[PDB]
Structures are given as C-alpha cells and as structure tokens.
Design an enzyme around this catalytic site. Structure first.
Site, PDB file in Angstrom:
ATOM      1  N   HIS A  58     -33.941   1.792   6.269  1.00 58.20           N
ATOM      2  CA  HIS A  58     -33.743   2.072   4.851  1.00 58.20           C
ATOM      3  C   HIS A  58     -34.510   3.185   4.212  1.00 58.20           C
ATOM      4  CE1 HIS A  58     -31.403  -1.641   4.795  1.00 58.20           C
ATOM      5  NE2 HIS A  58     -32.407  -2.235   5.416  1.00 58.20           N
ATOM      6  N   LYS A 103     -22.444  -0.980  11.460  1.00 64.19           N
ATOM      7  CA  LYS A 103     -23.022  -1.774  10.388  1.00 64.19           C
ATOM      8  C   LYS A 103     -22.135  -1.497   9.167  1.00 64.19           C
ATOM      9  CE  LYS A 103     -27.557  -3.061   8.679  1.00 64.19           C
ATOM     10  NZ  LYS A 103     -28.478  -2.718   7.561  1.00 64.19           N
ATOM     11  N   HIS A 160     -37.541  -6.776   3.933  1.00 63.76           N
ATOM     12  CA  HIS A 160     -36.105  -6.935   3.862  1.00 63.76           C
ATOM     13  C   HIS A 160     -35.503  -6.388   2.569  1.00 63.76           C
ATOM     14  CE1 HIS A 160     -32.362  -9.367   3.191  1.00 63.76           C
ATOM     15  NE2 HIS A 160     -32.939  -9.577   2.017  1.00 63.76           N
TER      16      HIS A 160
END
Ligand SMILES: O=c1ccn([C@H]2C[C@H](OP(=O)(O)O)[C@@H](CO)O2)c(=O)[nH]1
EC number: 3.1.27.-
Length: 120
Positions: free
Chosen positions: A13, A41, A117
């Site tokens: 990310h 993904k 996360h």
C-alpha cells in the site's frame, strides 16, 4: 507477526516517491509489488505519502474497524485506487486507476504502533 504484517502493508500500500494516477501505473505497480503472482488482486490502494506520515495515522483517536475491533484510524491522504477490469488473468492483469486525495482507514497494532492492515 506485527513486523511481518507491517512489511506486507508496506509492499502492498505504500509508494511515497511517486504519485501514480494512471492505469499504466496500476498495471506496473500491482506487478512490481507481487499482487498478480497467482490471481489478479481485485482492488488495492497505494498511498503516496511518507512512511512516517502513515505511522503518524496510528496516533489519531480510535474508531471502529469493519470487523468491530477499535484499533482502526483514519486520515486523508493521496492515493491511487487500482480496480481489476476482469479482462485477463494472471500474470497479465489489467487495472483501472482512480486518483484523489481521500479518507483512508488503516488498522494499527504493536508497541510501537505500526499499520498492519488497510481497512478501507
Ligand atoms: O479502498 C480499498 C479497499 C480495500 N482494499 C483492500 C485491502 C484488503 O486486502 P489486503 O489486506 O490484502 O490489502 C481488502 C479489503 O479491504 O481490500 C484496498 O486496498 N483499498
């Protein structure tokens, strides 16, 4: 585990040096970062902010995660959302990019706190 989850959150990310914003960037990055290895993904956000700025988000007040836990935080950052088009399969995944400076929500864990996360 928080150290392995933190590195992974990094690989998936974060990209501060660039500013992406294009399908071509999504097509390149999604593959350089190993997210089309076996399957394309579906969706993924790349944050274009300094690592210390993403860690600094863990310090904001606490808010609920999609799962119900309360170790989630939010911040308005520059990102490039990569949406799979569905055309081809791995390793040839094609993506659609969207740029905006928007509100992201990440989960932080450990001591010191680190992002582990991407909630949304
Ligand atoms: O704006 C969004 C929404 C979702 N996801 C990813 C993160 C999660 O998978 P990951 O933990 O493998 O990154 C999953 C559900 O949020 O979709 C993003 O990257 N960006």
């Amino acid at each position: 585990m928080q150290d392995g989850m933190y590195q992974r959150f990094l690989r998936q990310h974060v990209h501060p040096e660039e500013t992406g914003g294009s399908d071509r960037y999504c097509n390149l990055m999604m593959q350089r970062r190993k997210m089309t290895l076996y399957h394309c993904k579906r969706f993924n956000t790349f944050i274009h902010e300094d690592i210390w700025n993403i860690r600094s988000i863990c310090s904001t007040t606490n808010i609920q995660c999609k799962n119900g836990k309360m170790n989630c935080h939010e911040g308005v950052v520059k990102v490039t959302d990569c949406r799979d088009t569905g055309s081809s399969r791995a390793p040839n995944c094609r993506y659609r990019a969207i740029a905006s400076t928007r509100r992201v929500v990440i989960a932080c864990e450990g001591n010191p706190q680190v992002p582990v996360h991407f909630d949304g």
